[PDB]
Every structure is written in C-alpha cells, then in structure tokens.
Amino acid sequence: GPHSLRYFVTAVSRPGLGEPRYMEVGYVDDTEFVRFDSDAENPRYEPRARWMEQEGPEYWERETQKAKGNEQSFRVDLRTLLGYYNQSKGGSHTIQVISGCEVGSDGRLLRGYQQYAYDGCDYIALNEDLKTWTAADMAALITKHKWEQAGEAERLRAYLEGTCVEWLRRYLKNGNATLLRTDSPKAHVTHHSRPEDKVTLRCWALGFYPADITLTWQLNGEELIQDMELVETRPAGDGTFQKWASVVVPLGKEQYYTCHVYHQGLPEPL
C-alpha cells in the first residue's frame, strides 16, 4: 500500500521570561523519525529510530542549520500574527503546521499538503490543485494576496513532488523492515459482578502495533452496540497499545456472548 512523510511544527510565544520555542518532528507513516526543540543544551536536530542514525554530517548539519533558519523565521511570524489580530503581547500564542506528501501505491505522488493554524483553529491551507490556497480567516486572506504574489505557492509544488519524494524514499529503504512488522495481540475477558441482576464483562485488547484494531461483542449473530462502552485507543509505555470494550450481561446468561478482536497481524475468522 502507500506511505507518509508529514512534518508537524510548533512555535510558542513564552512572554516574560523566555524566547519562543521551536519544535519540529518529522513522522514517517506513524513511525516518528526526526525532531528539533529549542529547549535542549545543544538545540539539536539529531536522530530517532536507529536507522536515521546511519547517516552523516551533510544531512545532519545542513538540516540542523536549515531548522535554526526556521526558528528565527517563525519567531518573526509570531509578532506578525499578533499584529494581524491586534493582540496584546502578554500571553502565549501557538503556531502549528503540518507538511508533506503521501506516496502513491506505486512510488510517486498520490497526495500533497500545507496547513497553518494559529492558536488551534485553521489559518492557512494549500488546496491540492497545488496552487490554490485557502484563507481560513479574515486575516489568512492577508498572506493570501502575498504568498500568492511572490512564488511561495509555486515554489512549494516542487518541494512536494520533488524533494519530499526523492528524499522520502531513501528513508523508506534504510529502515525498511523496521517501519512495519506488525504486532500480534493477546486477549481475554474479565467478568465483574455489577450486581446480581447483571455482570459487567470486559474485553482486553492489549499488546499491539499498529495503533489500530476494532473490537466487538457479538451476541451470536447480532453485533452489539447499545451495551457497548468503548475506551479509546491508547499507548502503553512500551509502545504496545491497548483497548477494551465491554457489556452488561444477564447474570446467568454470560456464556451466550462472544468477544471479537480484529487486527492485521491476526488471522482471525468470524
């Protein structure tokens, strides 16, 4: 199937004591692979996953460099929006962004992106016909008529279909059988009196990767819902995950119920 190469970025205004924070982490698929974070001794853009750690100083250095170039670039952006909105320099302000390209089911480009959101809420987006942008708010319109002006729309096309791809595959090769290799779950149920009319039973899906699964209680045919309590899915230290779902079953009439866990590294019928 296909793949990601998204870059999620955060810059926060820390007004009073502290200069703006800068964080960029590049994810691969869901496999987290690079970071930068202005709150480190050596404000570094160094590894994650052993595989990135099998590269050298022209990827590190130019790209540590490249990031720092962004730190300052933003920290100017923060002052600007602040202006746009006519905000008082006082509290924190948050600038986020997700960037990237999805490789089609054959090794080229089936997707391309560019989001900006200021203080949780959409600000700018690049709309797919990688040329039109959309101004979310009243003041995203402002960059529109400039960002479009110069070549910051057209010059992107290239990053995406180009570099973002060209580059992207090196990664999807050096940490090949790493970025995948499913994790078979282990399950059980745990009956619990709640009480004497009924007995809550509960399903244990725990020990998996990828992050997804879909559990179910099937009362012999009918797939049960309204009796269903769902935990939504959550990571468990180890980087295993876990999930569970439950039902309020008539004390006595317990056995008549079926527990169902389905996940891609599990060959599980019914």
């Binding site: 870059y7 970025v9 790209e63 170039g69 670039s73 952006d77 929006l81 960037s99 960002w147």
Partner: peptide, 8 residues
C-alpha cells in the same frame, strides 16, 4: 527532508 518555510 525539511522545508524552509517563510513568509507570513
């Protein structure tokens, strides 16, 4: 790779 974002 990384991008050199600017403008705003």
């Amino acid at each position: 790779r990384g991008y050199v974002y600017q403008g705003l």
